[PDB]
Amino acid sequence: SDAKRIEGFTLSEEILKSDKQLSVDAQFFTKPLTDGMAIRSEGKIYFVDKQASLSDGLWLVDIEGAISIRELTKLPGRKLHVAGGKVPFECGIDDIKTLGRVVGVYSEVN
Amino acid sequence: SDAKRIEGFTLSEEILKSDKQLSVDAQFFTKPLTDGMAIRSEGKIYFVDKQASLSDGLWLVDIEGAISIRELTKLPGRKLHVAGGKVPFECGIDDIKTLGRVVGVYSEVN
Amino acid sequence: SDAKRIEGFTLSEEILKSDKQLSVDAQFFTKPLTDGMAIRSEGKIYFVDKQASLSDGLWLVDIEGAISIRELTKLPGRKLHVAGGKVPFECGIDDIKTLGRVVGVYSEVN
Amino acid sequence: SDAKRIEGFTLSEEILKSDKQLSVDAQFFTKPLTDGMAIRSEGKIYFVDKQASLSDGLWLVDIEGAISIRELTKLPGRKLHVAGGKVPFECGIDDIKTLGRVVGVYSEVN
Amino acid sequence: SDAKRIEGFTLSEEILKSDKQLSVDAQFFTKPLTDGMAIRSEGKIYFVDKQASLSDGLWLVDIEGAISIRELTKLPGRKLHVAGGKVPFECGIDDIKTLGRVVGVYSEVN
Amino acid sequence: SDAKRIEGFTLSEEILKSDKQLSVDAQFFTKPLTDGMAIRSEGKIYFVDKQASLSDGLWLVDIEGAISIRELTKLPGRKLHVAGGKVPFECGIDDIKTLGRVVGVYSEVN
Amino acid sequence: SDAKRIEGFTLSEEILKSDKQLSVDAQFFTKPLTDGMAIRSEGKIYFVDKQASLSDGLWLVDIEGAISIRELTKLPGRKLHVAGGKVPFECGIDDIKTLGRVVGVYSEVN
Amino acid sequence: SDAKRIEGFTLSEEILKSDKQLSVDAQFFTKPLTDGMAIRSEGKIYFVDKQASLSDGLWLVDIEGAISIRELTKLPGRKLHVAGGKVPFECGIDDIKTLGRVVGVYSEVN
Amino acid sequence: SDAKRIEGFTLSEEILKSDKQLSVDAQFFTKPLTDGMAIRSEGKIYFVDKQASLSDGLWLVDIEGAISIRELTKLPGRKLHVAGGKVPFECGIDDIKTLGRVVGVYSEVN
Amino acid sequence: SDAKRIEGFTLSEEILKSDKQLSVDAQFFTKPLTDGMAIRSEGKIYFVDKQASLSDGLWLVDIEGAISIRELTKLPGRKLHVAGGKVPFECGIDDIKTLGRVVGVYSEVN
Amino acid sequence: SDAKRIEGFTLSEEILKSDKQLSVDAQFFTKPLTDGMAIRSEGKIYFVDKQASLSDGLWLVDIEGAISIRELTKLPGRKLHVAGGKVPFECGIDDIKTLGRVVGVYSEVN
Amino acid sequence: SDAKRIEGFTLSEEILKSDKQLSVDAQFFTKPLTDGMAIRSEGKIYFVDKQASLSDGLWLVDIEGAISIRELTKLPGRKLHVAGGKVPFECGIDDIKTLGRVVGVYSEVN
Amino acid sequence: SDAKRIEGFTLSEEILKSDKQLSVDAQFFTKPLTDGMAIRSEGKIYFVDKQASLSDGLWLVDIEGAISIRELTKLPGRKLHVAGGKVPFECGIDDIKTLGRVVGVYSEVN
Amino acid sequence: SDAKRIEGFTLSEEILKSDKQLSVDAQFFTKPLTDGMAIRSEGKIYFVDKQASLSDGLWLVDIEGAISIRELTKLPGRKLHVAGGKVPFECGIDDIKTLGRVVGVYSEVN
């Protein structure tokens, strides 16, 4: 029906690399995803919104050069609780760069 | 890049209903998905393979008219362990009808 | 905005008694609730769909005359698992009468 | 019977947005809800009392611009325990702005 | 304000004995308590409705002559789950005699 | 038998408010309750002894204007452990005002 | 003040042996203990009421000749749950002889 | 046989009050109890030795005027662990006044 | 002071074997131990009373020829619960032969 | 066989007191117990070696005049962890006086 | 150094299918793997010994046509416990066909 | 089919020692393993990529001369969490030397 | 000092195979081990006594041809509880053949 | 077969004492044990390698004169975690003297 194209990437060894475009349907997103990223990482496909404003959730981030998907929770004092890696930690929102919020995920692997 | 169209449906109150077709990319499936279904159910989209042969995994099923997504496990004696509902149960593979195997899942809701 | 009137009742000591009508808005229900009931029971107001078809969920039910709100789960062989009371139990679907499905709940008490 | 109109809003991505007014019945509230908000958020509707005075309970809050519903508990030293998000935390009552106390919740999703 | 008199009793060593009448306010009972008992038992006062119809709840009962307060739960097959003593058990509804349902309890001992 | 009148109040949103007098029997209290209060709070009625001398127990208190029922425990150094709220805490006996001790509780809600 | 004499015994290796009379005060017992025993067993003195009628509680018993103190709980069918020994068990009330109920216990060992 | 009189008291709301003398048999105490107290508190009688020298155990104490029965444990640095109340705490031995050690306890309430 | 000699044995691989006499003092036993055994087993020395009458406790037994120390508990029906080995079990009192009851235990190994 | 005499004592209320000599066989001790104590405490008899050199284990100790049996564990910095009483604690090796090490324990009470 | 060639296969949806040979070193196996299979299944490579004699361990099996890797444990009565799938079960050794025992496993995915 | 030669080593007592080369197929590695090591350690064979860039994962490391396989997790501030040994710890990324990432493990011991 | 030779074997895949003799010292066994086996099995060496008579313990056994090391426990009725494998089971002592009792174990692997 | 002599010792009360040589077989050690010790301690024999270089493991140590077997773990900052005694602790590598690493253990006591 409604074909939609999204820029594709792969995330491996914490390095983000451009890839084939991915064809998806607009029905995948409740909110319109205009500037989006489809990131292929460990058997899953993460749909990212580069326009998203900081808010608790799952995010694509860059921490001192390393790229990854982490769950961010704001703490008082412009701080962040960062989960998703083998061990969670805290830091200032300025110690990290957010590339966008994950709006949806696709997996083939239960 | 490679647009693929799948028949769409919605699953609600255990009733399967046809719906808009869904545009997906072939890169979504490692094994080719020829006769497939895209079922929108509770904020997720399940991709089902109508051609799959019975094997342990996540399935779209019809139990005495009710349609649902359940985890099936074969047990000696042509029996099945059926999980996924509020309470798991057992029954013969002949007491249930399999509509297809879930090959992948898309979710917006973490 | 949009005023909607629902027949009201109170449930106490397993007896259903009619009561004042309740004014609600249509925005409370994603699916249209046409033939509905508002049951006041223990500090909560349960909105029920009398038209609902049997499907796993929370139901207003009549068991040998006693009325109650219970979690119903279909088991192969026209059976039911009944939860919600002090001790769950099973029975056949014909041993119980369903009045309707709870589609929403309002509570003041956390 | 008794129709009552409340200003309606939606809360999403931690942003509060005005919306359609909601028609409710005064029987919903034991205490009179004069200046109130009906906030639609994730399949639930929260009724907020803007006039409430700080007291332990469920609150609509604004923390450095973010809007959310949190469980507040006063600690000695004008301090607060804030629960409800992925990770609880403490802070001064002056580090957060209270917009109103939740006096009731409607939910369609069990 | 509204003085109400209830026949009083004491429960000790599982023997029910008449006692001084008790003066209570009608405001103590949401539903009217017409034929009631006030049973003093172990630092508490149980208010009992002799007219109650069997329903899941806390009841004053007589089991083979012994009088006690038990939590009763109906089970399929005219059966009962009886809790409240040191060890819960099951039996037929005909194996026990109900004297009334507790509608309220007063206690001075936290 | 013996009718006794006690001043009634309701406690809600941490505010105490006078209300209907309540009629109670003297048999409710082992020790004489001369200057008492009956506080209606969350489906229960607390009987308070304004004359009580500080001693570990359940009290009606006033902390910086907020009124509540809390379990107090004296700690060396004129200090107090205050429980009952979502999160317990300590403080000096002079940082809280005691209105009276709960000598009994009536409830209809198990 | 009020001196009271009770026949004394010792219980050891499940054998009841007569012993010195024990002088106690009537204030020890809320109900009058007319025909009583004072049984010295493992550092404690149990006060038994030989006239007690069977009721759930702590009993001095004789099972197939062996004497011991057990917690008895009546079960439907003239049955008993017998706890207190290394492993509890059930039996009929006729399989055991009750010598009296323990109405009080004195201990020097915490 | 051997009648022994002990001065009696009652402990309530943390206030010790003289009462009727209690008649007890010397067989109750392995060590001779010369200057003793019999404290009636919450359905139990505590036998206290006023002569006891500080040692870990159950004690009758006076903490800033409040009288209670507490479990005392000496800690290095003339400190004490005080247990028995709703919340245990530590303090210096000089912050508490010991009135005597509990040598035995009688109870009618299992 | 008071020397007492007891016939000694060692118990190994479930075989009882006579050995050196063991010199013990009578103060070791509250009850006189006239006909006793001193059994050396796995770094411990069990003192056994060959004259003891069956009663719940620790015994030296002979089961189908195997000798061991077990915890015996009488069950209704001339039955016994036998614990102490890797897996407890039940049997009639006539399926086992009791050699004596352990009245005390000496150990070097904590 | 081999009679051995040890100086006996009783430990009660943290006071050590001389007592009857105890006759024991040398077979009780793997290492020779030359200068030993037999301490009767709470139904057990502790054999202590006054000559033992400090090492982790069970010890008879003297702390600010109080005598007790404690489990001692060396911690770097000439420190000790003291266990055995209701609440463990640490201190310096010089804050406690050791009287001997427990080498064996006899008990009649399981 | 020592190149070794093993017949390769893939196991997917319980179907075993031949594939590219796999080159391995003899140093991967302590016991010589003469007739072996290298089966690729879910990101892991299983090395199977077709000649193995039944013994508890991990096995490549065929149950009613379905192919899988399972942990087998012999039970008295020519029986087998089969683990590895979502729900273990038992069956006769003749209800299953063993294809070989897994001697080693290679994984890339931790 | 496709033979590949990898330098081999053994890791024992934290010392890495050269050993026989290992023949492996390229099918073992999704990504090309150009400069690889095969580390034999405690019954397993670790395949390491000497050119891997620092990224969260399993690594072969050299800490102050000691060589081991550890799970590394980057923490803000050029820090690392090091797991795998008996007790995890943190340190700067420069306090450790990374020799390569483990991309695969072969094991014979389940 | 005292060199002792023992017949060696290896146990693998449930097959017992003769091997190099092992040289051990007689100090390894408290009881003399005259005809003994040293079974190397999974990094440990089990020393077996072929002359042992049945008794609860760890045994080298032969079950329908399979050789293994199991914990045996005698049950009434000439039965055995057999533990050590993935799943314990029972059977008659005549359904199993005992080769010897393990008297000691040596391990290099913690 | 291959006899090997090792210097023997006994470890008791934390004192190390030379003893008879122990004859073992070289097959006990995968790595050659040239300068080794056989330490008899608590019914077990520890085989120690005096030449071992510091690495995580079980060690024979000397802490301020005291000799024991402890589990050592290196921590950043030339520190050690020391386990094995009743309470683990930390300290610098220089606060402890290592005598050798345990390479194997023999035990008769399960």
From Swiss-Prot, chains A, B, C, D, E, F, G, H, I, J, K, L, M, N:
Query: Know the name of this protein?
Result: Repressor protein CI
Q: Which family does it belong to?
A: Belongs to the CI repressor protein family.
Q: What biological function has been recorded for the protein in this entry? A: Repressor of lysogeny.
- What domain of life does the native source organism fall in? Viruses
Query: What's one GO BP annotation on this UniProt entry?
Result: negative regulation of DNA-templated transcription
Transcription regulation is among the record's keywords: yes
Molecular function per GO: DNA binding
